[PDB]
Amino acid sequence: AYGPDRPLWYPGNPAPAYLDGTLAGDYGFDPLGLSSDPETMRWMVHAELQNARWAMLGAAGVLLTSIGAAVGLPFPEWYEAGAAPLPSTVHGDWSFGTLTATMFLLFHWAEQKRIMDFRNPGSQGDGSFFGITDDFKSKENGYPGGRLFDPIGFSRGDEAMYKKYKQNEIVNGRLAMVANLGFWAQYAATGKGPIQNLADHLADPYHTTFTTNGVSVPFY
Amino acid sequence: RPLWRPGSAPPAHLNGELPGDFGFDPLGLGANPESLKWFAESERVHARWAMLAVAGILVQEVVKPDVFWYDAPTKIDLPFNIVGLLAFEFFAMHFVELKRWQDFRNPGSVDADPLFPSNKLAPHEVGYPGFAPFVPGPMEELKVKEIKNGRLAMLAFIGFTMAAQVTGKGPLAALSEHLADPMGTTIFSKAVVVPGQVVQPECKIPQFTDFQGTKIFTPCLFQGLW
Amino acid sequence: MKNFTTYLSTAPVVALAWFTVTAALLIEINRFFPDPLVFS
Amino acid sequence: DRKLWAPTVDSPSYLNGELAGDYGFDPLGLGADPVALKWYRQSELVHARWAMLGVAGVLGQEILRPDVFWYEAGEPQNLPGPFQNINMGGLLAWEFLLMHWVEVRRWQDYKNFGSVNEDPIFKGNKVPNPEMGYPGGIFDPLGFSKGNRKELQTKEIKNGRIAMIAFMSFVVQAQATGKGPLANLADHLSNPGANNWVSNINHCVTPSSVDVQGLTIPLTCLWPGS
Numbered sequence: 001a002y003g004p005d006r007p008l009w010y011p012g013n014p015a016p017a018y019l020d021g022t023l024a025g026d027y028g029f030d031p032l033g034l035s036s037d038p039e040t041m042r043w044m045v046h047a048e049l050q051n052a053r054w055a056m057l058g059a060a061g062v063l064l065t066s067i068g069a070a071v072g073l074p075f076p077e078w079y080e081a082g083a084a085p086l087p088s089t090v091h092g093d094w095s096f097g098t099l100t101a102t103m104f105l106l107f108h109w110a111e112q113k114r115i116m117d118f119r120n121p122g123s124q125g126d127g128s129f130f131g132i133t134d135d136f137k138s139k140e141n142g143y144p145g146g147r148l149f150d151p152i153g154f155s156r157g158d159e160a161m162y163k164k165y166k167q168n169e170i171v172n173g174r175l176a177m178v179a180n181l182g183f184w185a186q187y188a189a190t191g192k193g194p195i196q197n198l199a200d201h202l203a204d205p206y207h208t209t210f211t212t213n214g215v216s217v218p219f220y
Numbered sequence: 221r222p223l224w225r226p227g228s229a230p231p232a233h234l235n236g237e238l239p240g241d242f243g244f245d246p247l248g249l250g251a252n253p254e255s256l257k258w259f260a261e262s263e264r265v266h267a268r269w270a271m272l273a274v275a276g277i278l279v280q281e282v283v284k285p286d287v288f289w290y291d292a293p294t295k296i297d298l299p300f301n302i303v304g305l306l307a308f309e310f311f312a313m314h315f316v317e318l319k320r321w322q323d324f325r326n327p328g329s330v331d332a333d334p335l336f337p338s339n340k341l342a343p344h345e346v347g348y349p350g351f352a353p354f355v356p357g358p359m360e361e362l363k364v365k366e367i368k369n370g371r372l373a374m375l376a377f378i379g380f381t382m383a384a385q386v387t388g389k390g391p392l393a394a395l396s397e398h399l400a401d402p403m404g405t406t407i408f409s410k411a412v413v414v415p416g417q418v419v420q421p422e423c424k425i426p427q428f429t430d431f432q433g434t435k436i437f438t439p440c441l442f443q444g445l446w
Numbered sequence: 447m448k449n450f451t452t453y454l455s456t457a458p459v460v461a462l463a464w465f466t467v468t469a470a471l472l473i474e475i476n477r478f479f480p481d482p483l484v485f486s
Numbered sequence: 487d488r489k490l491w492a493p494t495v496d497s498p499s500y501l502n503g504e505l506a507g508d509y510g511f512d513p514l515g516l517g518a519d520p521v522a523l524k525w526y527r528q529s530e531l532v533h534a535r536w537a538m539l540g541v542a543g544v545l546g547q548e549i550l551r552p553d554v555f556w557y558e559a560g561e562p563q564n565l566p567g568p569f570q571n572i573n574m575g576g577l578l579a580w581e582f583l584l585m586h587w588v589e590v591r592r593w594q595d596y597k598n599f600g601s602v603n604e605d606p607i608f609k610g611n612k613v614p615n616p617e618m619g620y621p622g623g624i625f626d627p628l629g630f631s632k633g634n635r636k637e638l639q640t641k642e643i644k645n646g647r648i649a650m651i652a653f654m655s656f657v658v659q660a661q662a663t664g665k666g667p668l669a670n671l672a673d674h675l676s677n678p679g680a681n682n683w684v685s686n687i688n689h690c691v692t693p694s695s696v697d698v699q700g701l702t703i704p705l706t707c708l709w710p711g712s
């Protein structure tokens with residue numbers, strides 16, 4: 001990507017005008033003109049830079065806990081790692097209701113600052129929160145660089161590395177999002193959770209396909 | 221300039237001034253100049269701590285081969301209570317670390333004896349306090365020896381820890397076990413992951429090691445990914 | 447999309463949406479709190 | 487003009503005739519990009535040189551030691567001398583680092599031609615490496631490249647292309663009949679019509695998997711066995 005002649009989605013079909021090629025992982029793919037509006041593009045870009053990032057962390061977990069449960073290490077599979085008893089705390093024991101409320105409360109604070117800067121750039125960088133200013137500024141939409149969000153300084157360093165890194169993030173994030181639908185759809189058909197599904201497919205690769213799983217192909 | 225991989229091209233940020241520069245930044249971490257300056261302080265501090273540690277682990281195995289370095293704290297009788305030793309250690313380390321950092325923050329500010337203003341460390345480069353009663357050879361040559369020796373030590377420590385998790389002995393005992401059956405003690409000879417099978421080395425470290433009646437959680441680094 | 451959103455804003459579409467939400471809200475309220483004759 | 491792969495074809499421009507064995511054979515236009523042609527060539531040469539060594543070993547091993555089936559000779563017990571039942575993990579360790587050095591060095595000659603030519607440890611000792619893929623020097627001891635290396639290169643590539651095709655025959659005619667390269671020649675010459683690919687392609691004769699020192703290794707026949 002990052003080019004006027006960037007590889008496209010359907011070789012031959014011309015790319016959309018709004019999709020110039022600058023945006024990370026741009027392949028001119030908007031068939032239903034969902035991002036026809038420029039403001040819509042900015043919002044959609046931010047949203048993708050939000051779903052993919054969470055999806056990437058979520059995929060890392062469903063794979064690490066799964067790898068553990070397969071090796072034997074006591075790890076509840078992603079599907080049953082919610083009914084697992086909540087751990088105690090020095091303050092006290094955890095309650096599901098409090099846990100949900102605390103999770104939303106904290107998220108509301110961060111989401112507000114992120115969206116407020118998205119709507120008003122640099123709004124958060126007003127030393128209002130303990131004097132943190134530039135660190136609360138946004139290098140780009142979906143790129144909140146600083147000395148609190150990009151500590152190592154990939155963005156502050158070589159732009160080419162930063163740009164390359166931006167492509168890695170978009171491509172990996174899109175893969176993680178697709179992978180996540182898998183983890184869920186393979187569960188809601190096989191009932192086993194990944195790393196067990198990879199292990200079954202590597203033990204009888206020809207007779208362990210989606211076709212032979214009861215739910216995928218109904219007649220077969 | 222010697223490079224980590226002959227024929228490679230050193231990244232622009234590594235023009236080479238920091239002692240022991242070999243144009244090695246495959247991921248471009250120290251791209252930010254200030255970030256590289258910090259990483260430089262981290263590299264030296266890590267190396268010096270690791271160099272003392274690796275040496276101590278080896279010595280504490282020549283002198284007292286019984287106590288295992290990994291569980292030494294639980295196998296040794298502290299002259300003072302851990303709480304008291306930890307308390308003193310915290311304040312002691314806190315003081316040196318603060319003055320040490322203040323120099324990196326504002327160079328040449330803590331370069332004086334606070335109790336006796338008469339005493340004052342001469343002007344010096346960051347990362348090099350000035351304690352150089354004896355320097356055997358060119359300063360830069362000795363600097364390269366310090367970073368090369370330090371980088372080797374840091375790698376050795378991870379080796380000491382991992383070997384102590386795969387096997388249940390220290391560096392000298394593990395090396396001897398290798399010297400005994402060289403072609404059957406390697407990690408390959410004790411752990412193999414095939415496209416269908418997963419043989420991982422047993423963790424010889426109890427998940428929790430009780431200390432003075434307080435079980436201390438001792439996890440085997442990523443025991444799940446071996 | 448600017449002109450699709452314009453269409454989704456026209457009176458017939460907005461009224462269809464507003465009412466559906468209001469209707470569903472009342473339906474869901476009675477679904478969890480049924481037989482609401484008095485405010486007790 | 488050079489003789490091309492078919493009497494009616496016209497050579498692709500990129501195949502002007504510089505490389506040895508240029509019979510204008512690029513039906514899929516894979517070597518169109520000059521970078522890919524460069525890389526693919528190095529892959530052809532490496533594959534040829536490895537198959538010529540391989541097709542000699544299969545044939546040779548059978549001629550001398552006829553009890554061991556070529557397909558089943560990598561088994562620890564099958565290994566001769568003390569090698570019999572030698573920890574395969576320890577063996578892999580040697581075959582690993584040693585191969586990694588030679589391969590990476592060769593790869594850096596692709597990335598930067600004529601850069602990795604001098605002995606890294608010692609010094610002065612360097613290899614002419616006149617062409618990428620043709621280092622010579624210590625690699626050419628008896629000195630035969632000093633003559634018409636291009637003509638010798640043409641013979642080398644042509645012999646290698648025949649070998650590459652032959653080693654994959656040895657592989658199939660072995661997982662079908664269950665017998666080695668020259669044993670399949672003998673069976674044909676005994677009863678031609680009854681010992682053909684017709685009476686042998688309907689069975690994948692060779693274990694479905696092999697447990698090696700506790701590591702089960704799954705096996706497969708190139709054609710789906712009937």
Ligand code: CLA
Nearest residue numbers: 238240241242243244245249250259260262263266371374
């Ligand atoms: C103690 C941590 C540490 C830190 C802070 C640094 C920092 C630095 N190194 Mg360095 N290095 C280290 C350890 C470290 N190194 C070790 C152990 C080795 C031996 C292999 C080397 C070998 C080395 C070479 C050959 C060179 C450098 C160079 C540099 C400088 C530029 C490269 C850079 O920006 O990367 C920054 C480094 C970090 C931000 C630390 C990375 C920490 C990550 C998050 C850990 C990832 C896993 C890690 C690899 C540990 C593996 C454990 C296990 C698998 C063995 C920089 C200031 C270059 C230089 O000298 O230029 C002046 C250079 O040529 N290093």
Ligand code: CLA
Nearest residue numbers: 375376378379382383386387394395397398405406407408
């Ligand atoms: C200076 C670094 C160093 C050195 C000299 C050694 C040496 C040795 N290790 Mg070891 N190791 C290291 C680092 C090192 N390790 C690190 C950082 C880790 C964590 C990933 C491990 C994890 C490890 C395990 C799990 C095991 C060993 C084992 C061994 C012994 C041989 C069997 C083997 O499988 O080796 C394999 C070597 C490795 C797995 C990693 C070594 C790679 C190093 C870092 C590269 C250094 C290259 C450089 C040129 C230095 C060369 C060595 C010397 C000139 C200094 C051997 C004496 C085995 C053992 O305990 O014997 C019974 C074994 O079980 N190591």
Ligand code: CLA
Nearest residue numbers: 505507508509510511516517526527529530647650651654
């Ligand atoms: C992996 C082995 C290999 C590789 C890398 C190459 C590479 C190359 N060959 Mg080549 N060739 C080979 C084997 C190989 N050859 C064999 C065994 C023969 C004997 C039939 C030939 C005969 C041949 C001729 C006559 C010519 C070439 C030419 C070329 C160059 C043209 C560019 C190109 O299309 O590249 C792409 C090629 C590859 C990437 C090789 C991979 C194979 C593809 C991906 C699939 C093939 C599967 C195959 C059919 C399986 C065979 C099984 C069977 C033996 C049982 C190129 C660099 C032309 C040339 O000399 O230009 C200077 C040309 O005239 N070759």
Ligand SMILES: CC1=C[C@H](O)CC(C)(C)[C@H]1/C=C/C(C)=C/C=C/C(C)=C/C=C/C=C(C)/C=C/C=C(C)/C=C/C1=C(C)C[C@H](O)CC1(C)C
Nearest residue numbers: 029030031032033034054055058061062078081177178180
């Ligand atoms: C572009 C275009 C254009 C045109 O116009 C139109 C169209 C075509 C439509 C378009 C397309 C689109 C698409 C494709 C989309 C997709 C998305 C996704 C898949 C996402 C995911 C997504 C996914 C995701 C997020 C994920 C998430 C997850 C998470 C967080 C977490 C989880 C978990 C884990 C860790 C583990 C535990 O134990 C449990 C839990 C807790 C559960």
Ligand SMILES: CC1=C[C@H](O)CC(C)(C)[C@H]1/C=C/C(C)=C/C=C/C(C)=C/C=C/C=C(C)/C=C/C=C(C)/C=C/C1=C(C)C[C@H](O)CC1(C)C
Nearest residue numbers: 056059060149150151152153176179182183194195197198
């Ligand atoms: C910001 C910052 C700043 C500073 O300076 C520095 C630093 C710190 C470095 C930075 C950070 C960064 C980050 C965070 C990153 C992350 C990453 C990730 C995690 C990814 C994931 C990622 C993830 C992913 C992709 C995922 C993947 C997955 C997949 C595909 C899947 C697969 C599969 C399935 C379907 C199921 C089955 O059964 C099985 C299988 C077959 C297996």
Ligand SMILES: CC1=C[C@H](O)CC(C)(C)[C@H]1/C=C/C(C)=C/C=C/C(C)=C/C=C/C=C(C)/C=C/C=C(C)/C=C/C1=C(C)C[C@H](O)CC1(C)C
Nearest residue numbers: 511512513514515516533536537540543544559650651653
């Ligand atoms: C040119 C062109 C152009 C257009 O465009 C397209 C197309 C047409 C496609 C193309 C073509 C291509 C081709 C033909 C390729 C081929 C390849 C091969 C066959 C290789 C082999 C390859 C082969 C090889 C390497 C071989 C190897 C082997 C080895 C190492 C070894 C073995 C053995 C022996 C000694 C004995 C022992 O006891 C055992 C073992 C160990 C087992």
